[PDB]
């Protein structure tokens, strides 16, 4: 998963729990987001990953305080999602990375970039 | 400090804390990092921030279970640090942000980026 975050589960229950754990033992590690595409936490503690695919320009909202129900809401302003996974990734600001932006991007699609004409 | 995290202290004792993950267990609580550069938690609870600068390509390891001693260990693989603060920040994956990578990066330095030439 990632170096400064906590791997939990395998296959479709894979979890990239952040919140580390202060390098302790059987702590209550939390804040997990399933890495498997179109799989999402089923419980608030993310004990199990469930399957609820969306479409482009949508994220997966998850109301419930013990077991989640799922609503495939549209992408917020300033974000995008070009897959069925249903995660609002932030826009790639080309300007802070080195380039200008050729097409600005929208809910469906992320920005592309036109550099500096050398 | 940050909207979803907890400001504590002022000046050089400036730190930010995460929710104590009150879920259960006894692993730890209020994991805090200090904001002022080259200042690091002195105790596990991060009651006070102490001063222990490193160099580029190094992080600050902190062994001790009540009061920390400090070892300026090198940066882990996959990370960098270009300052004396001694924090291993993760590499900027240009590909997931919008761009390609012109120079890949190393322990000393993070990656710069190259685009799509169309």
């Amino acid at each position: 998963c990632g170096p400064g975050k906590v791997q939990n589960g395998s296959g479709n229950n894979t979890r990239c729990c952040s919140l580390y754990a202060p390098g302790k033992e059987d702590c209550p590690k939390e804040r997990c987001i399933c890495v498997t595409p179109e799989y999402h936490c089923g419980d608030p503690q993310c004990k199990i990953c469930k399957h609820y695919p969306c479409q482009p320009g949508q994220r997966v909202e998850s109301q419930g305080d013990i077991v989640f129900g799922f609503r495939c809401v549209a992408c917020a302003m300033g974000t995008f999602s070009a897959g069925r996974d249903g995660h609002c990734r932030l826009w790639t600001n080309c300007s802070q990375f080195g380039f200008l932006t050729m097409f600005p991007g929208n809910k469906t699609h992320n920005a592309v970039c036109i550099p500096e004409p050398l | 400090c940050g909207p979803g995290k907890v400001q504590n202290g002022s000046g050089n004792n400036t730190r930010c804390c995460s929710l104590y993950a009150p879920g259960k267990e006894d692993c730890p609580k209020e994991r805090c990092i200090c904001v002022t550069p080259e200042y690091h938690c002195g105790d596990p609870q991060c009651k006070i921030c102490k001063h222990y600068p490193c160099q580029p390509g190094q992080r600050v390891e902190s062994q001790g279970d009540i009061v920390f001693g400090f070892r300026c260990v090198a940066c882990a693989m996959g990370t960098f640090s270009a300052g004396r603060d001694g924090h291993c920040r993760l590499w900027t994956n240009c590909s997931q942000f919008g761009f390609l990578t012109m120079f890949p990066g190393n322990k000393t330095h993070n990656a710069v980026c190259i685009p799509e030439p169309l």
Epitope: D43, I48, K50, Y52, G64, I66, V67, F68, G69, R71 | -
Partner: antibody, heavy 115, light 113 residues
Framework: LQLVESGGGLVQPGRSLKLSCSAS????????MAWVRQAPKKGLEWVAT????????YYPDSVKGRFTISRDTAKSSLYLQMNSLKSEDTATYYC?????????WGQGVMVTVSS | QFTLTQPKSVSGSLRSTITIPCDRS????????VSWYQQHLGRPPLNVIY?????PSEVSDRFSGSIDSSSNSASLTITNLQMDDEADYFC???????????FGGGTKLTVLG
């Protein structure tokens, strides 16, 4: 895990009762806890939800405004303050824990609302 | 919100496979979650499945759940039906914060003796 309901019985129409569910058995305050009822010979009807802290409560409909759920770590007890009871509230009332999905359940206590 | 409809009953021979279909009915978000609870005599319900599958311990592997169709259609499958599997079967649902928790109307499983 053991859950024991109590405080049910025969009560007049328009009256009130308080059910209790004693627990320990697991991590009471460290889990959610539910009330569910069933008329004898009929189906299960979900009745109540108390936040593990006890700060917030969640209910269905036919009893919203009339019933109440709360917790007291003292003896791991639930608090079904049922008010303004009607003949349709006659049922076996069970406690259990929404944790992941109704983990364990009690034997139930019978409430009879009768003229 | 208010939905979840279950067949009235079925009679099945020992060693047969019985499928109990909990139709979401106006399910909308049918994949949100499902659980199966089992009730015998005047005893309390026993949780057979939470989380669509992952049967809790003790319950026999012969009980399995699946959420297929995605056209509103969770199902509880009992393979190799045994004599101690006579019972009313209930499918608890989600809507944990959509509105309120809900339960199906129950399905009676009788055994061919």
């Amino acid at each position: 895990l053991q859950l024991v309901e109590s405080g049910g019985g025969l009560v007049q129409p328009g009256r009130s009762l308080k059910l209790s569910c004693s627990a320990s058995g697991f991590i009471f305050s460290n889990s959610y806890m539910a009330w569910v009822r069933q008329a004898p010979k009929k189906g299960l009807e979900w009745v109540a939800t108390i936040n593990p802290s006890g700060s917030r409560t969640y209910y269905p409909d036919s009893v919203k405004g009339r019933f109440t759920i709360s917790r007291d770590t003292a003896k791991s007890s639930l608090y079904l303050q049922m008010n303004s009871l009607k003949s349709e509230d006659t049922a076996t009332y069970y406690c259990a824990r929404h944790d992941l999905s109704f983990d364990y359940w009690g034997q139930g206590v019978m409430v009879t609302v009768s003229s | 919100q208010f939905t979840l409809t279950q067949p009235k009953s079925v009679s099945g021979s020992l060693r047969s496979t019985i499928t109990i279909p909990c139709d979401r009915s106006s399910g909308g978000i049918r994949d949100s979650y499902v659980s199966w609870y089992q009730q015998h005599l005047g005893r309390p319900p026993l949780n057979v499945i939470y989380a669509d599958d992952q049967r809790p311990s003790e319950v026999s592997d012969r009980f399995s759940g699946s959420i297929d169709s995605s056209s509103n259609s969770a199902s509880l499958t009992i393979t190799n039906l045994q004599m101690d599997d006579e019972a009313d079967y209930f499918c608890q649902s989600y809507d944990s914060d959509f509105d309120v928790y809900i339960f199906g109307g129950g399905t009676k499983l009788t055994v061919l003796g």
